């Protein structure tokens, strides 16, 4: 197996510090130029830092003098020490082995904010009372009032993936709201149950909602 895994992201006040770390299965950091890159919505990927195998460090002007990249060759851990954080540093941060066959991780979100985390309220979306029609029925879950992104909604433990729509979150007065829909045969709903499970990792919450109940 080969993968890179970033950690350390979270909410941090402007002016604060935060250290990200990156570990790997099957990549020995000491052997390569290792980097951090970050992704902001609709902005193009931005290089943040590199450290060569010999320990030479490199930074763009946006972060130079504030961010420091370093490596523990014994434990095989890559770090990004972020200091004097700014609102514009808010992004998804990736570690990357950039030369040869490039590799990067799943990313870790850094949100520079005065705000605190807020878990979502999760509400089921089911048809109103009345006569039925149709061979398919569409159900949903409304995931309201959370901060920061992201949430994941899973239907019947992943068993309904093909039929699902995930609606991009919207930000209003510091809180996000998103929804997810699924379409299933009417022959077996509501006779059988459907459940949405909503994970919001930032607040460490997972909530399940059953859709008839």
């Amino acid at each position: 197996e080969v993968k890179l895994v970033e950690s350390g992201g979270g909410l941090v006040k402007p002016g604060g510090s935060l250290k990200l770390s990156c570990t790997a299965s099957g990549i020995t950091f000491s052997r390569y130029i290792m980097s951090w890159v970050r992704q902001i919505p609709e902005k193009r990927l931005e290089w943040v830092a590199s450290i060569s195998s010999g320990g030479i460090t490199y930074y763009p002007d946006s972060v130079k003098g504030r961010f420091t990249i370093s490596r523990d060759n014994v434990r095989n851990i890559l770090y990004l020490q972020m200091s004097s954080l700014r609102s514009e540093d808010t992004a998804l941060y990736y570690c990357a082995r950039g030369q040869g066959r490039p590799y990067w991780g799943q990313g870790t979100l850094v949100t520079v904010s005065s705000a605190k985390t807020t878990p979502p309220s999760v509400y089921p979306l089911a048809p109103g009372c009345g006569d039925t029609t149709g061979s398919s029925v569409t159900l949903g879950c409304l995931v309201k009032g959370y901060f920061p992104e992201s949430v994941t909604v899973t239907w019947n433990s992943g068993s309904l993936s093909s039929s699902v729509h995930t609606f991009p979150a919207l930000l209003q007065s510091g809180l996000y709201t998103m929804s997810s829909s699924v379409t299933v045969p009417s022959s077996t709903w509501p006779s059988q149950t459907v459940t949405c499970s909503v994970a919001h990792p930032a607040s460490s919450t997972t909530v399940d909602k059953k859709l008839e109940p």
């Binding site: 990067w104 109103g128 729509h165 609606f167 929804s179």
Partner: protein, 219 residues
């Protein structure tokens, strides 16, 4: 640095046909060892970025050979033969000839398909939400094509704009359609002053809007 430039969109392609995505560098990416340090990656709707090709000619793991890259000097093209619905997303070029690495702005691959009317579904507020004094009425306008659509809300036959917020998906990876959610949010007290809540969708597939409603007092 080397600047990598791509168009934000390509022309839309029909399923099964070939697509091209063009990328320009300011400077050659060919090194003295004969290798061109160009790579391509994809970001699909709602997934993490996936390497496609590196060093111009090497496919990444899992990548089918209907993906190819060619070019010379400042000019490169990613070709995708026999485009599939799942290919939709934003394709990026990048270089690792130099430090620092530099990245293109991405080109969205768009699929052309047959028109499809929206499936419209309206949902009342949950009992749970109401217990907390809020009332969101949700409408899904699902699996339509083309992407252009209009939604209107009416409360007792009178148009309502205040408190409505809309969200639109990217092109669907499975059937190449588009969807949208529209949510009307009121206080429980406002909600309980009317009975008819109406979501209406206007799309090119018909002159008449598709109307869904429920009645709060019907049952």
């Amino acid at each position: 640095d080397i600047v990598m430039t791509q168009a934000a969109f390509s022309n839309p392609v029909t399923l099964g046909t070939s697509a091209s995505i063009s990328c320009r560098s300011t400077k050659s990416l060919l090194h003295s060892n004969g290798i061109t340090y160009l790579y391509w990656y994809l970001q699909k709707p709602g997934q993490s970025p996936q390497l496609l090709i590196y060093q111009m000619s090497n496919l990444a793991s899992g990548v089918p050979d209907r993906f190819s890259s060619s070019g010379s000097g400042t000019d490169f093209t990613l070709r995708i033969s026999r485009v599939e619905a799942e290919d939709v997303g934003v394709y990026y070029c990048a270089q690792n000839l130099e430090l620092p690495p530099t990245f293109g702005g991405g080109t969205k691959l768009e699929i052309k398909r047959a028109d499809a009317a929206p499936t419209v579904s309206i949902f009342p507020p949950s009992s749970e939400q109401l217990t907390s004094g809020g009332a969101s009425v949700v409408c899904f306008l699902n699996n339509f094509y083309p992407k252009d659509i209009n939604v209107k809300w009416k409360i007792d036959g009178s148009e309502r704009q205040n408190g409505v917020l809309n969200s639109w998906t990217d092109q669907d990876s499975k059937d190449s359609t588009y969807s949208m959610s529209s949510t009307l949010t009121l206080t429980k007290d406002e909600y309980e002053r009317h009975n008819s809540y109406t979501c209406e969708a206007t799309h090119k597939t018909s002159t008449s809007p598709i109307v869904k409603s429920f009645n709060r007092n019907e049952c």
